[PDB]
Symmetry: D2
Subunit: 115 residues, 4 copies
């Protein structure tokens, strides 16, 4: 399993749980096509995602629905959503982890890439 | 302030990120992204002169920062293609938006500082 | 710029962190922390007027930001006691240091922007 | 095991491995006393640390030796080290995770606290 996501809440100092996360593979027409989606688990993680064989070289975009996460705590968010576009390249494609640490007006993001 | 300014910094190096291409869009009635403005950052890491209190109506705006180019430009292959900020501007009237991004090759952070013209 | 300024922002709320107690120390010959300067942040989130190009010799300086007080002051019990920045200043000659901290109750980030007087 | 640390490198998009991490319990005299220390593992984690029974209510300080981590990649750091002081209070003391994401001039930090 090469693609995991994690969401933290820097307001509660907990995992963000039930964050809708939608992945998109860029299509030839340089058009964003749905690839996989799921809801963050108990611990703020999502390993659903993909198959080693299905995750091929390309432009991928992880889109996190944060506004929703914020609204639901009855906090007013600045962002519409968080998104991260990266290239699944590297040597040949490996194991990614896309962490997002959130706040109403600020979010961070990181990739932890390991072989 | 101008209704919109961007501040880009380098966490690798300890300085403003100079000459970073930045691109602002607005969602069209259409659900399509319309070119609103563009600039490159200056010597202080800043980008002003973007829009006007007037031209800057309510809507969903998207700031795209060409992070990729900047890192490459300096010899490093960063993780990310860009950095995008998606937000709703002027729904409760005109505000002053200050979007800052702190960059590392595999990490970036963005904050918003919103304020009242008055 | 002054040789040292601090910029504190609120990520919860989308603004400068106003009236945040900040405390600067210097390690004494002694290995003991000596009171160098102190201020509270202003309306813009800033703190200037701290030292002087002259009073600000080489050394290890520690900036302590009273994060705890600020959050409590606004009804939230934050995780952290303070925020401390430990660094070596003016070893390759006088520089201009800009320390910023972006705060959340369970998270804080700090960046340094260093520059040449000339 | 109530206390874990994790260190990421936002320059390499990897875990920071072999980061000296030293914990300190505040003593009555409001003096910092050694409590536990260890080196970050393969994955940037450190679970050595403490025993549920030994980790009591109090002021704790995790001190990360980052300058060393940076020097060793032959990169010049701004910080002397990263430190985090917190109170092991809560309801009654629970499970902490102190993550630190680092860069030469910037570092972030977070607690993920769960029951
Ligand atoms: C803001 C600021 C940010 O927008 C972000 Br995303 C992070 O991570 C930090 Br830390 C700070 C300011 O930070 C600075 C730093 C300097 O040197 C000058 C400034 O004008 C600012 C900000 O406005
Ligand atoms: C558990 C936690 O409680 C925190 C963290 O933090 C990690 C990475 C990390 C990311 O991704 C960001 Br964007 C920031 O800002 C920081 Br600080 C730390 C983890 O992997 C992690 C776990 O597992």
């Amino acid at each position: 399993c090469p693609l995991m996501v994690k969401v933290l809440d820097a307001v509660r100092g907990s995992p963000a749980i039930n964050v809708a996360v939608h992945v998109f593979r860029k299509a030839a027409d340089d058009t964003w096509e749905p690839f996989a989606s799921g809801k963050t688990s108990e611990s703020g993680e999502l390993h659903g995602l993909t198959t080693e064989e299905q995750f091929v070289e390309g432009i991928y975009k992880v889109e996190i629905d944060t506004k929703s996460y914020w609204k639901a705590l009855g906090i007013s968010p600045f962002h519409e959503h968080a998104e991260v576009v990266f290239t699944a390249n590297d040597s040949g494609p490996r194991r990614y982890t896309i962490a997002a640490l959130l706040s109403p007006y600020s979010y961070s993001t990181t990739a932890v890439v390991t072989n």
